[PDB]
Design a protein around this nucleic acid. Sequence first.
DNA 1: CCCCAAGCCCG
DNA 2: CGGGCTTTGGGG
Length: 226
Amino acid sequence: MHPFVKALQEHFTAHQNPEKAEPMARYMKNHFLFLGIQTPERRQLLKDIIQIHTLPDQKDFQIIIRELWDLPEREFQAAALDIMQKYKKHINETHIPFLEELIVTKSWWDSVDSIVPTFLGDIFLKHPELISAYIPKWIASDNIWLQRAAILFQLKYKQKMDEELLFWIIGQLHSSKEFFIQKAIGWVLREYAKTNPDVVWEYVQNNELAPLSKREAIKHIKQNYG
DNA sequence: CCCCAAGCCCG
DNA sequence: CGGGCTTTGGGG
Ligand SMILES: COc1cc2[nH]c(C(=O)N3C[C@@H](Cn4cnc(N)c5ncnc4-5)c4c3cc(O)c3[nH]c(C(=O)N5CCc6c5c(O)c(OC)c5[nH]c(C(=O)SC)cc65)cc43)cc2cc1O
């Protein structure tokens, strides 16, 4: 175990709050143990360890993240994503398999909704020619979190949205009965409707979607149509 | 500060 | 199903 990770584990554990850990763990449907440390203090505790030990060398970067990913309490995956932000400008196409592995390990919406729109979205914005090397596999996978990755990687693209691709992806997954797929479709359409509401409205009025997906997509624009 | 973004519950 | 309410988190 890297010294940075041991120090972070000791420091988090010394500030654990079992009273808060119970509702925090219930909120994530008891997929994970929690220490009970909410985000403001969790980020201060991480800042303390970086100040003392310095940020790990880039050569250890994936190893540090993997070690944190393997620890039981969910705050360690959250801190791992905070650490990944510190290397953001260096994340590139060679890291897609590493991000895939993070998506399919200790999976839930909290980690995936951080990994995908920020880290993957930025990679594919610079390297759109790589989208077709990953997105078809992700849609076909049995893994709902990779399917959600295919939906959400363009979430914050605004005028760089590839509309044909977005609608093709949604069409491939529109029959899913999985809540997290139906809701991801609703989210990405709702978000894109902040940039181009007319196209989203016409899409949902003319293509099949789960009721949840349609409702979530138009809940902030429907008052402007009809 | 603001406004944006799962779980629960009832109709 | 629709959607109002809750809490904390994301980002300006
Ligand atoms: C790419 O772009 C984006 C990515 C994003 N990720 C998130 C996100 O990851 N969220 C938002 C928000 C979860 N969340 C909360 N409220 C809403 N109204 C939401 N709507 C959607 N999600 C929502 C949330 C996370 C992640 C987490 O890891 C979270 N953890 C908790 C949590 O832990 N909660 C929420 C419920 C809750 C706690 C908590 O700490 C508590 O302290 C123990 C709590 N106590 C109680 C009670 O005694 S009831 C009186 C409830 C309660 C909330 C939470 C927002 C977001 C925004 C973006 O634009």
